[PDB]
């Protein structure tokens, strides 16, 4: 998927034409930059030591967000049936990417406490970790289903080395010798063709051994009753269908968890807005930056505009 791409600028360091022009009427419209934002400050902010601790923990928060993003982009997509949750279905904080990135409403009481965010950030991180753990549980279930997939049906289609009971003829044994007269009633022909059958009888072992493995190429043994092979094939088909359903229904829940993780990442970006505001401005949360996924030219223009607060 896409990693974090939010800009860093406090309320006092807006890069637009005006301080309040970051949301709209900025020069970014001329350059077609998709940047958008909306303020959503917390109830209160911590002290300078609390701000430094939050800045230190922001690295761990970003690492957790990256882990969640990698899990969502890998586990769902690899199943080839879980990527059906679009941006609207995976809307962050209930709003699509068009509106989720244009506001910080995820700072409401769902993941944080709408309060001093020094511990609310850690609580939201723990909630996102729980969501990622649920996604990992879904991925493990998908892996176990895939283990149920590629079942006994993966063997040969009968009259061969493996799963040859499905092509059995059901004193005689399953031989299916692929490329005789005696006292025994060797005048017989089994139905062991997926292969060929040969004259054999159990009354005298000479004809049976001659037909089975005595000369030429030795035949391959198989289960006498084809009912067991049919049951195994049916179980394999059922397991494959269950794996496909899990990749389509259980992995649909995984995609829903991925949308929840996107909401958690939106909340993390909302928290990081206040973190940057504290880092490069006063303690109270107030930011005028923007979050989007622009082109290289738009980012360069934004950096040229904001060079007054360059890194």
């Amino acid at each position: 998927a896409s990693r974090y791409w939010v800009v860093s600028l406090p309320v006092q360091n807006s890069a637009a034409s005006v301080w309040n022009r970051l949301q709209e009427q900025i020069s970014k419209h001329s350059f077609d930059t998709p940047l958008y934002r909306f303020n959503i400050p917390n109830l209160r902010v911590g002290t300078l030591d609390s701000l430094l601790a939050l800045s230190d923990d922001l690295v761990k928060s970003n690492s957790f967000v990256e882990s969640v993003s990698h899990k969502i982009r890998r586990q769902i997509e690899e199943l080839e049936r879980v990527s059906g949750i679009e941006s609207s279905s995976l809307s962050v904080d209930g709003v699509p990417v068009d509106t989720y990135l244009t506001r910080f409403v995820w700072d409401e009481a769902k993941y944080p406490t709408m309060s001093p965010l020094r511990e609310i950030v850690d609580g939201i991180h723990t909630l996102v970790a729980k969501i990622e753990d649920d996604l990992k549980v879904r991925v493990a279930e998908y892996n176990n289903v895939r283990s149920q997939l590629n079942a006994i049906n993966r063997k040969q289609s009968g009259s061969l080395a493996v799963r040859d009971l499905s092509n059995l003829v059901k004193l005689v044994t399953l031989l299916a010798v692929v490329p005789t007269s005696y006292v025994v009633p060797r005048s017989s022909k089994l139905l062991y063709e997926d292969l060929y059958t040969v004259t054999l009888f159990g009354r005298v072992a000479d004809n049976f051994r001659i037909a089975a493995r005595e000369k030429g190429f030795q035949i391959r043994d198989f289960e006498y009753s084809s009912e067991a092979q049919e049951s195994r094939n049916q179980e394999l088909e059922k397991l494959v269908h269950d794996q496909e359903s899990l990749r389509s229904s259980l992995l649909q829940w995984c995609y829903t968890s991925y949308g929840e993780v996107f909401s958690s990442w939106m909340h993390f970006c909302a928290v990081r807005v206040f973190a940057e505001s504290i880092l490069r401005y006063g303690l109270p949360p107030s930011f005028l930056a923007c979050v989007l996924a622009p082109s290289v030219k738009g980012e360069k223009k934004v950096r040229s505009i904001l060079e007054e607060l360059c890194g």
Binding site: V183, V184, P185, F201, R203, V204
Partner: protein, 47 residues
């Protein structure tokens, strides 16, 4: 041709089993006909 030989084999097995049973039958009969001179020393000699 060995389909009839299966009947012969079964008859031979049954004959062997019956011969063993008859051979043990004499011993079983003698187990009661004989040694009762000892058991009568407890069943009635006690009286």
């Amino acid at each position: 041709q060995m389909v009839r030989f299966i009947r012969q084999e079964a008859e031979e097995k049954a004959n062997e089993i019956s011969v063993s049973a008859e051979e043990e039958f004499n011993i079983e009969k003698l187990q009661l006909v004989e040694a009762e001179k000892k058991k009568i020393r407890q069943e009635y000699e006690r009286k």
